[PDB]
């Protein structure tokens, strides 16, 4: 019943003391933190506490949208040699640093996921040519579904896939995705392997990655310019912003101290130094 | 006019949205439907119907009528498999083309129990006892009855009742398995071995066929709708 926006426990006025009770003495061998408050050690007056923990609630701590990835696509001229650039990105929070570390404060989580799409385009070649306002399809390809090989192949029919046709210039795109995990919680860290190396099998056949569950965990997004070739080249950058809503978490873990290296927990050399120089007897 | 503020997402078209929109033919007299026999309400309903499995997919037997026939014989008893099959209904060539798999090919995740049914198709006079077994994953796929017999199985006796059913009980680490080949969501192994042997009297065809069927169970479900690969349009 104690909500987030509740006033914190008050400070009780306590006077001088000379008794056989020892708030001050403990033993951190027990693993337990000694739970004291100012009054326990020094004389205090009465204080009606006003501050609340309101903002520090798990839900509020993740209430911000965050850039997960930057997908780049383009629409070149018809005569061109290179193909029209259409991107495919494996949906994961671990491509960027910020949001990841925040999510790493715990062992597991559940959250309905909100994605936002900020598209931004421009020309590239020195020319005064023209491009009419461009549209963009963002097709979510769940694991196993046919990944588009061309920018104009059958896959874009999306008879079952959930897509979003964004018209450039209008407000950023947004879609809601519930907790879609195969487990009873999303796993930030997975101490194990997908395969088991059997003895009646060759090492190769039984080998897999350390820390990985399913290579394809959530699927890929596919983004393409819908409008056809235009004599003047136009490149586009779609920025995805994720805001984890309705979030729950379990078992806290120490926050990442050294820079990330790969999708794993691994650390690169040359970054193994986080704390600076400070003399013990210097304030 | 009522003061409003446009929010993120406006003007965007979700292929999976569910909004109201204007009608092209206002006041259209719709013809009433009639009681057309056999109405379906859910895809799973079709999944629970038994469908014949193209087991033997050899280059010479694939894409033909021979694929569904698993031929047994009166050869002396051995411990070597008649048929092996991996539980990955939507990704194993054999299962992936049965009703179950097809429906499964439209979803990302599947869960529940499955049941295989084997139909003997020999002469009345032919007898025998076979063993169909489902071994959960995480170990060596059996190659001898000795191992297979250590898992989940049914010992089937061929007789007046021609069909036997072995249920594959939903035993998995995750609440839902991927509809694609994946180690993390692996399914295990389905195997069939001769319990005794096939015995036939004189003047009797010494070899015959068995037909396999598969179907989901009342507890089975599928989620996260997706596009299938079992079809395409080249240009």
């Amino acid at each position: 019943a104690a909500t987030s926006r509740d006033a914190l426990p008050n400070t009780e006025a306590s006077g001088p003391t000379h008794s056989k009770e020892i708030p001050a003495l403990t033993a951190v061998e027990t693993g337990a933190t000694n739970p004291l408050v100012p009054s326990d050690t020094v004389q205090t007056r009465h204080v009606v506490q006003h501050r609340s923990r309101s903002e520090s609630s798990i839900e509020s701590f993740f209430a911000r949208g965050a850039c997960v990835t930057i997908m780049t696509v383009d629409n070149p001229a018809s005569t061109t040699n290179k193909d029209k650039l259409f991107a495919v990105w494996k949906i994961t929070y671990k491509d960027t640093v910020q949001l990841r570390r925040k999510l790493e404060f715990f062992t597991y989580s559940r959250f309905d996921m909100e994605l936002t799409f900020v598209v931004t385009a421009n020309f590239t070649e020195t020319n005064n040519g023209h491009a009419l306002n461009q549209v963009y399809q963002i097709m979510y390809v769940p694991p196993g579904a046919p990944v588009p090989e061309k920018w104009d192949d059958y896959t874009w029919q999306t008879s079952s896939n959930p897509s979003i046709f964004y018209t450039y210039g209008t407000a950023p795109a947004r879609i809601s995705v519930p907790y879609v995990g195969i487990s009873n919680a999303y796993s930030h860290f997975y101490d194990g392997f997908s395969k088991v190396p059997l003895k009646d099998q060759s090492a190769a056949l039984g080998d897999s990655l350390y820390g990985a569950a399913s290579l394809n965990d959530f699927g890929i997004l596919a983004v393409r310019v819908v409008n056809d070739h235009n004599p003047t080249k136009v490149t586009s950058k779609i920025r995805v912003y994720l805001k984890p809503k309705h979030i729950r978490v379990w078992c806290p873990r120490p926050p990442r101290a050294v820079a990330y290296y790969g999708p794993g927990v691994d650390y690169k050399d040359g970054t193994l130094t986080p704390l600076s120089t400070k003399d013990l007897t210097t304030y | 006019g009522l003061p409003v503020m446009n929010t993120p997402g406006s003007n965007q078209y979700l292929t999976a949205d569910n909004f109201q929109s204007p009608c092209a033919l206002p006041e259209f007299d719709v013809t009433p439907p009639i009681d057309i026999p056999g109405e379906v309400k859910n895809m799973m309903e079709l999944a629970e119907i038994d469908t014949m499995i193209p087991f033997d997919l050899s280059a010479t037997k694939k894409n033909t009528m021979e694929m569904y026939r698993v031929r047994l014989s009166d050869k002396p008893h051995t411990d070597d498999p008649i048929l092996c099959l991996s539980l990955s209904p939507a990704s194993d060539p054999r299962l992936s083309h049965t009703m179950l798999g097809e429906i499964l090919n439209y979803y990302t995740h599947w869960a529940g129990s499955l049941k295989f049914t084997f139909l003997f198709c020999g002469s009345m006079m032919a007898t025998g006892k076979l063993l169909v077994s489902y071994a959960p994953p995480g170990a060596d796929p059996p190659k001898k009855r000795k191992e297979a017999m250590l898992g989940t199985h049914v010992i089937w006796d061929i007789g007046l009742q021609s069909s036997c059913t072995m249920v594959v009980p939903w035993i998995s680490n995750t609440t839902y398995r991927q509809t694609i080949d994946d180690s993390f969501t692996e399914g295990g192994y389905i195997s069939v071995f001769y319990q005794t042997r096939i015995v036939v009297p004189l003047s009797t065809p010494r070899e015959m066929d068995i037909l396999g069927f598969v179907s989901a169970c009342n507890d089975f479900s599928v989620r996260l709708l997706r596009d299938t690969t079992h079809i395409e349009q080249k240009a």
Partner: nanobody
Amino acid sequence: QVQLQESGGGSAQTGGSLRLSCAASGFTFSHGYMAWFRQAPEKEREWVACVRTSGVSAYYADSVLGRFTISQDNAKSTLYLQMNNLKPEDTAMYYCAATSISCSSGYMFWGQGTQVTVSS
């Protein structure tokens, strides 16, 4: 648009050697593996060999052991399959399956493949 395009041909005499290459693009998130697969004329698709992300740690298939060599050049973003001692069993199509992996089985990107023929 992770474009995987094989090259290397396939029309050698029995016993020779070929260099099977594969141009990779798009976004190959290094970490994982990069490999080779063969379908054969009339058999099931079979795993040939897999090499680690950037690491030159690899394995080979029992059938091909030592007679095939799979490396990489992540500077050139390519993988190579040198094949010495080609034989009548090696006659087949080869595919550069280099994406995700994590092992020697999982994929989200394949190539168009190329045929090899060891004649004699």
